[PDB]
Design a protein around this ligand. Structure first.
Ligand SMILES: Cc1cc2nc3c(=O)[nH]c(=O)nc-3n(C[C@H](O)[C@H](O)[C@H](O)COP(=O)(O)OP(=O)(O)OC[C@H]3O[C@@H](n4cnc5c(N)ncnc54)[C@H](O)[C@@H]3O)c2cc1C
Ligand SMILES: Cc1cc2nc3c(=O)[nH]c(=O)nc-3n(C[C@H](O)[C@H](O)[C@H](O)COP(=O)(O)OP(=O)(O)OC[C@H]3O[C@@H](n4cnc5c(N)ncnc54)[C@H](O)[C@@H]3O)c2cc1C
Ligand SMILES: CN1CCC[C@H]1c1cccnc1
Ligand SMILES: CN1CCC[C@H]1c1cccnc1
Lengths: 440, 432
């Protein structure tokens, strides 16, 4: 006799996917979102008269779950200008910037990446079962920097691969766990060209908020925003959910999809398992932020890397024309490295990378400052991947989802969608009337 | 008003996927299956005390739709012994058999395959929009053999790649359209290692019938077996479907998922578009069949190619042990080349590739003989891919699905599932 059959906490892709599965099963589904908006770590906004993505933006057909969703809801891709580049730059730790011909830039980053993932085939023959091989659990004691040191690359190759890996870490490469990178590379077909195509090339048509809205509208679930959940208590046959205004909402099952780094805001009765509590105390590495810069000059199609001691770690063209100028999509590995609020400062840094450009605008999202992300994409530290199931395991009638809890594209939208599907399966298992299956 | 909201004709992966989408949308969904079994061109059966797949068998995580379904319904994979091979054989057109070192076999087939798809990246940057580039459009005037001739391969490499392409054609390579092959290679990440990993390595746990049963059970739809559909007639706001016992079932919308080569068995009133009728009259190339052989000796992990003029085109180990022996999974490009019901004849052909094998058993499925498949996997002839839209286009309140109508893995289960998702979306558009 609970208020709802299932309550999904979080309006991200994991929460929307879970709510859609549960909703189309006929359950009474309620979704609670702490922010006043949906999308979670994806954020569709506006800047310089265009639609932009402050968070997750790019998907690919080699990512199975999100692509299946796009086929279901009839969404294709929108291509960003990543081919036929006009300029390619590398900024080293000292701040010097070197312009390289795009062809040799691509060949060097290809060589560096493929040498860093030389054993991806043998370590991860099944990327969606990450602990399948004993050499993978055994390589969870090493960082990305540890391998980079043994690669023996050129100065430019090491700078590029360290910029890539620092960006994916949201931190310096000494803290970044190696198996997660090997596993993501394996997810993209064990081939650098395809994997690179998966990461920053194609956006969702109508925006990520379009797919979120498609799933939640299809679900028929009730969606409540500006309702943060502060505590969850398991009772017999159900759960009691308490919000920051102390209401009580009772449910048969609750699916937790909040980011790992935010679990400290919610109290659980009884306390979670020691493994899950340890994961909550370590959290996840990324400290990233996203910045868009509108410049009056037309720079064409530009791509740039910047090493971990510089702020503009990933630079890419969003749109360009004589009329417009250029809109730059920039991803920052660590928010500490730049005051994205001091716009002389970001202008100085931009002009440090592109000399003499007049800046017309920027807009930036600091995912570290947001109390409901407290970090950016999922980035596993050393030794964390091996304990991943400790995060996935259900605790009573509390299910756990989110990109951090996925087996495949854990740093991506696809991982969130996957965890949402798994959450829907487990919800069906708990609310199942005749045939009850809960293996592992 | 009508008997049902939606009627899905066909109990394959496309039909089961469509029935699942429509069923969980709340429509009253009825699915009609001509055979007494489900699965369509996949068939989970038994042989030599083991589970076997007479049709579609192998899936991969680089195939998005079927992998998403496996994630939803909690199905893992079963690995077949395809790595660390013990023997690799090539049988040329003359019937001579040559044993190659597995490493040299692997990079010879790698070289041939990657030279065959050297432009796959340019031509298909978006494999799920096959006509995105204009060079795909006019590489649709070429056969796969046309390119193989320009590759200038070795004897061995040409034998291997022509055996591969002949099996994927279900026909000789001179009739096989090139862009479909380039597009499938593009779907697997433009890389031969990944693409080969997608095709014959991993089966579904619990079998393909397990996934079909998961989808249809989830759907809540009504399923009728041994009910072939003979005619479809459009009235306003609905469709009239007539079975082979002359009952009439009225529906708001009908989803056709039957194989292309069987469309001659169904009359449409009004008649379909001239493009669709053209596709129905050309059909699709494949003439393949599948054969399992039980031998007393343990050959270990074996893989073998046979060129288009020999019958045992694709050979690989299904299971092996000293007590068991060996169970061989063999795919035959053209059923004409071997009489799979004469156990003695196929014993001779098996013994031609592995000399001195005592054969303990056989089991075979002839997909050409089945009136409800009349062919095997989807295989596009020259120029057919360019008209793919003609097959996909809806005609009134009749929607069309099936692996032949998919944009991606058209020769696979994943293509059928994709077409089922699109069919569900179009049903949602019509009934809202
Ligand atoms: C800048 C950036 C770039 C990235 N780029 C890409 C990319 O290009 N492609 C890609 O695939 N992925 C990308 N990622 C990763 C990605 O977008 C995430 O993996 C994905 O959005 C995770 O979704 P989620 O549902 O698992 O979690 P979230 O999206 O964070 O959802 C959790 C939800 O829970 C809410 N919440 C938190 N606490 C509470 C509480 N106490 N009560 C109620 N609600 C609460 C939050 O508001 C949020 O809505 C990027 C992420 C960022 C931030
Ligand atoms: C030997 C073989 C090997 C292959 N191997 C693989 C593989 O390893 N991996 C892979 O992914 N794919 C493989 N394929 C291809 C594959 O299995 C098909 O792509 C897929 O099953 C297509 O499904 P479908 O729903 O589109 O059509 P079908 O599976 O053929 O379903 C159509 C249904 O319609 C029914 N039907 C026909 N006419 C009528 C009528 N008039 N009235 C009512 N019903 C009718 C049929 O009985 C059938 O059940 C293989 C196929 C075969 C045969
Ligand atoms: C998609 N990627 C996965 C994690 C980070 C994210 C990314 C990569 C490059 C630039 N910005 C964001
Ligand atoms: C799955 N493949 C796709 C089309 C044919 C089919 C196949 C390939 C190799 C051996 N048997 C069947």
């Amino acid at each position: 006799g609970f208020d709802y059959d299932v309550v999904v906490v979080g309006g991200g892709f994991a929460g929307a996917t879970a709510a859609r599965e549960c909703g189309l099963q006929g359950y009474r589904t309620l979704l609670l979102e702490a922010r006043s908006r949906l999308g979670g770590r994806t954020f569709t906004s506006r800047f310089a008269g265009q639609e932009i993505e402050f968070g997750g933006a790019w998907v690919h057909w080699l990512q199975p779950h999100v692509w299946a969703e796009m086929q279901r809801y009839g969404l294709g891709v929108v291509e960003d200008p990543l081919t036929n580049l006009d300029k390619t730059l590398i900024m080293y730790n000292d701040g010097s910037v070197e312009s390289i011909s795009p062809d040799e830039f691509g060949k060097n980053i290809r060589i560096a990446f493929e040498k860093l993932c030389h054993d991806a085939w043998e370590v991860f023959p099944r990327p969606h079962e990450p602990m399948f091989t004993e050499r993978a659990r055994e390589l969870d004691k090493s960082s990305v920097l540890d391998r980079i040191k043994t690669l023996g690359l050129s100065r430019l190759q090491q700078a590029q691969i360290n910029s890539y890996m620092a960006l994916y870490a949201g931190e310096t490469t000494d803290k970044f766990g190696l198996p997660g990178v090997l596993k993501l590379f394996a997810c993209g077909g064990w081939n650098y060209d395809a994997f690179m195509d998966t990461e920053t090339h194609y956006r969702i048509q109508g925006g990520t908020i379009g797919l979120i809205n498609a799933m939640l509208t299809d679900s028929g679930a009730e969606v409540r925003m500006s309702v943060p959940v502060t505590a969850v208590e398991q009772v017999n046959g159900g759960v009691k959910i308490k919000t920051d205004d102390d209401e009580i909402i009772t449910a048969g099952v609750v699916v937790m999809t909040v980011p790992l780094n935010t679990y400290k805001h919610i109290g659980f009765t009884p306390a979670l398992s020691k493994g899950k509590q340890r994961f909550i105390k370590e959290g996840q590495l990324s400290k990233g932020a996203k910045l868009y810069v509108h410049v009056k000059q037309n720079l064409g199609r530009v791509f740039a890397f910047a090493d971990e001691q510089q702020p503009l770690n990933w630079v890419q063209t969003h749109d360009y024309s004589d009329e417009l100028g250029t809109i730059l999509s920039i991803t920052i590995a660590r928010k500490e490295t730049i005051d994205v609020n001091d716009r002389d400062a970001v202008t100085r840094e931009v002009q440090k990378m592109f000399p003499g450009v007049e800046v017309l605008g920027t807009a930036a999202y600091d995912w570290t400052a947001d109390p409901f992300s407290l970090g950016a994409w999922a980035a596993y530290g050393v030794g964390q991947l091996s304990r991943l199931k400790d995060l996935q395991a259900a605790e009573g009638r509390i299910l756990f989802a989110g990109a951090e809890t996925s087996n495949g594209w854990h740093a991506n939208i696809d991982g969130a969608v996957e965890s949402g599907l798994r959450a829907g399966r487990e919800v069906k298992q708990l609310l199942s009337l005749e045939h009850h299956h809960h293996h592992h």
